[PDB]
Amino acid sequence: EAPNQALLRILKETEFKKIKVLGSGAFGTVYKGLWIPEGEKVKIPVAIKELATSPKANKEILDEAYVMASVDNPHVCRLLGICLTSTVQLIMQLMPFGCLLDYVREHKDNIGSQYLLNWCVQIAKGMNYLEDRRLVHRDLAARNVLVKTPQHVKITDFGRAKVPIKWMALESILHRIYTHQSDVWSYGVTVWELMTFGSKPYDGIPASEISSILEKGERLPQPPICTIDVYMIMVKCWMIDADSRPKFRELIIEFSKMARDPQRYLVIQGDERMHLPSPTDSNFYEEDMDDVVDADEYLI
Ligand SMILES: COC1CCN(c2nccc(Nc3cc4c(cn3)ncn4C3CCCC3)n2)CC1
Secondary structure, three states, rough: OOOOOOOOOOHHHEEEEEEEEEEOOOOEEEEEEOOOOOOOOOOOEEEEEOOOOOOHHHHHHHHHHHHOOOOOOOEEEEEEEEEEEOOEEEEEEEEEEEEHHHHHHHHHOOOHHHHHHHHHHHHHHHHHHHHHOOOOOOOHHHHHEOOEEEEEEEOOOOOOOOOOOHOOOOOHHHHHHHHHHHHHHHHHHHHHHOOOOOOOOOOOOHHHHHHHHHHOOOOOOOOOOOOOOHHHHHOOOOOOOOOEEEEEHHHHHHHHHHHHHHHEEOOOOOOOOOOOOOOOOOOOOOOHHHHOHHHHHOOO
16 A cells, blocks of 8 residues: 655654653653754653663554654644654653543533533544544543643544553454444543543443443443433444444534534533633743744644
């Protein structure tokens, strides 16, 4: 097929500074940082993900990098570059408000229907792009959707892109089959996560039981804020026949239609009176903010 002409950027350790830690785990550790390229006279807010040095773990992060450098869409997290140190580190865009899952939990009181439906449109768009780029995500969830601004979210975590049981289609659990329509199932679950303001799908139920539960016809419940219209979409994403499930281009259309009249499709008490930070807020954006540009505007 088509040759992947993507440019992998190698960045000097000296070109950027680690400010603080955003999160630590098995993988290694993610840092908040700043990147000052050559003599460009720009500071770019970044997220630096670094890995003990074991040759197998380096192969895995270099696979994640391959995919992350291969994307270019406004609702997908691109790889800005890699830095070849003793450890090896991925340089990514800083998503100041972190993951969407924590965002919905921490801000339910100010999250209205417009935001929820717009997020749904945005994820369906990012996913539809991955489909265009013949890419299967294999790990879609509200944890792998990051918040740039409350009005702008992006799909990330290409560690699996070519197990998270409670997000997986039936075929994926029983036959290890992953299609674009299997991503649609995880899209349905992500939407559920948002509509419930961050609830754990199948709370209490052990991963082993899930397979049988789904086989019986059981599915995640209707969130209180959901109209039949919205839940009916979520349910279509969880059909046994993957070809029956909606396509991402349809999901874009469906949520977009609904985002034009959010109150008709999501019933939230206090809606419209609620407000989240915007680039039109006082002090929305620590050192020298003098020449800071966002990565989405920095293009060599
Ligand atoms: C499991 O390892 C990685 C996989 C990639 N993923 C990512 N992709 C693009 C940009 C970005 N930037 C980002 C991430 C942030 C953040 C600000 N920007 N604040 C919190 N996080 C994540 C990583 C630490 C815990 C949650 N992160 C973060 C976690």
